[PDB]
Amino acid sequence: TQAVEAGEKTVEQFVQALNKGDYNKAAEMTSKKAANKSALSEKEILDKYQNIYGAADVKGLQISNLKVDKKDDSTYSFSYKAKMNTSLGELKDLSYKGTLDRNDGQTTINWQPNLVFPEMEGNDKVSLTTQEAARGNIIDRNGEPLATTGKLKQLGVVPSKLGDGGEKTANIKAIASSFDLTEDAINQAISQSWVQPDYFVPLKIIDGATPELPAGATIQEVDGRYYPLGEAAAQLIGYVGDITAEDIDKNPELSSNGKIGRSGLEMAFDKDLRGTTGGKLSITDADGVEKKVLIEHEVQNGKDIKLTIDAKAQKTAFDSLGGKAGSTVATTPKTGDLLALASSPSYDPNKMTNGISQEDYKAYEENPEQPFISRFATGYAPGSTFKMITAAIGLDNGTIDPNEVLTINGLKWQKDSSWGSYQVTRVSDVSQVDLKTALIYSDNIYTAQETLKMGEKKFRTGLDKFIFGEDLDLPISMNPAQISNEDSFNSDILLADTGYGQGELLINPIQQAAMYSVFANNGTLVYPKLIADKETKDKKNVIGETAVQTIVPDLREVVQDVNGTAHSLSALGIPLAAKTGTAEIKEKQDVKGKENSFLFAFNPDNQGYMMVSMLENKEDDDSATKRASELLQYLNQNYQ
């Protein structure tokens, strides 16, 4: 039985070498080539595994039910069930049988071709045929396409039909001026190592009407992924790229010739969008005639995915950011439907999924405003908009009397001389401040005072009824919101700062839209939703109904009052409740101070829509309120 344990060990090491793809190591565990021993030499066994297991993309061979006996004094039979992963799926329940030779001090495998695949004999061949699945589409709430498979016009040149000397330079300048491209780019394209005189050299995808073609220029239709909104939804949707050898090594079921989601929803939903490869893996005789079919199924195209996004809201939201850094989230707050998820500045996903130069990609990655960031999913201090939450909490626990007026002198305030040089700042020197006035003028000193009055314990109790620490069920990569770094502030300054929305608070715009939905649902928090078919999850009694009915009329005043911070929106002539906010950011690496500008707005009559917008590191005189009118008109007309 000592020899039986050595034989079982030898089978286990053989299988492990096969599973790790070290075919030579497995081949070195086989006995000499004979008719009663091994059927091939070690190099020929190596080549057989490399050839066949590489053709089928075999990966992850694992065994079970291993039994090892004794058939003679030097021969021991073995058998086991096995499964493996291939480019066509899982090969389950394979019955392997063989023999081992103990013809010295070591035990070897009598290798036969039936330890590649069970039903293989002699010089049998393996055949793999595949049919590629078509990638599913991503569509908006009304069926409008966000990511589709379309026909594209590939502009290119043939260096032979271009010219020899003089006519070549004239036609290059003509094809460069007619399609807006560098003449050095066209020359560098036709002068790369892969090019031959008569080859078609691709230059650019044309996404419109095709102009007149100079000599040498030509258009050819190619099928590929297409993004109709382009940069307006690039961070949300993402792009696809060519599948690499390393992608196939990680997952054999990918098409070794198709596309893979590289970021965004294309990547989060890659499995359902890509479908499954069809075809057949079969063993054939030495003269190509099929003996056994190992795996076979028809192709399954990708399922379509339907979002809550409104394509026109998404485009308007993005365009309103005018290429500056910022984001906009629009929802229907009673169901949580995400109508728009805009991030700016952005990148061209069509340019990304086709041909992208290294210079253009480096311009994207080295842009200080970082267009690759999904700003709607990045944590920010929410800014002084957060006053609403602090007020609601203070109204629920009786700390805040809506009519009690604090007396505030000046633009700076601090609790005690213990704060040193730090002071809470406000913009408007209003002397008599009650809650309504603090909301209309966005008074941080009022909020700081009331937060310190409430105290850390009552404040955290109110905050913990929200979604801090929770992971939202959304197919968007995202960290959970936090109140602060640790579970205590351990600082009156930090407590005050958090009160008006800028301490160690980190909340991304989607989590902000979730928290602010209590003002559209009488204190019920409605979790946001991106997939159209999903059910509406919510969370009841996050703040009191009395708090909502006290604060929303003041939020109407933020728009209607002549000194309200959102008064420029009263031009719209629509029922509006809004709150503006700012946040000052200045870390150790920052030159001077940078400001973020925020806007929150919703319809207080029907609660049909809600919007949170932010401008990051705003230019002087810019604000999110300045940019919101167009989206608000659209939402108010189409979402009652």
Task: Quickly list its features.
peptidoglycan L,D-transpeptidase activity, Beta-lactamase, 20 helices, alpha+beta, five-stranded antiparallel sheet, monomer, Nuclear Transport Factor 2, Chain: A, 640 residues, globular, five-stranded mixed sheet, 2 domains, MecA_N
Structural overview:
- This protein has 640 residues and is an alpha+beta fold.
- It has two domains: 1-131, NTF2-like, domain 1 (Nuclear Transport Factor 2, Chain: A), CATH 3.10.450; 311-638, Beta-lactamase (3-Layer(aba) Sandwich), CATH 3.40.710.10.
- A hairpin with a 6-residue loop joins strand 1 (59-68) and strand 2 (75-86).
Give a brief outline of the structure.
With 640 residues, this protein is of the alpha+beta class. Helices cover 28% and strands 23% of the residues. The protein contains 20 helices and 25 strands.
Beta strands, count: 25
Based on helices, strands and strand pairing, what is the structural class? alpha+beta
CATH superfamily of the largest domain: DD-peptidase/beta-lactamase superfamily
Helix percent band? 25-40%
* CATH architectural label of the largest domain: 3-Layer(aba) Sandwich
User: Quick one: overall form?
Assistant: globular
What is the radius of gyration computed over CA atoms, rounded to a whole number of angstroms?
Answer: 33 Å
Beta-strand portion reads: 15-25%
CATH first level of the largest domain: Alpha Beta
Largest sheet: 5 strands, mixed
Q: What is the straight-line distance between the termini? A: 80 Å
Number of helices, where a helix is a run of at least 4 consecutive DSSP H or I residues = 20
Number of domains: 2
Keywords: Membrane, Transmembrane, Transmembrane helix
Domain NTF2-like N-terminal transpeptidase: 8-124
Domain Penicillin-binding protein dimerisation: 131-291
Main location: membrane
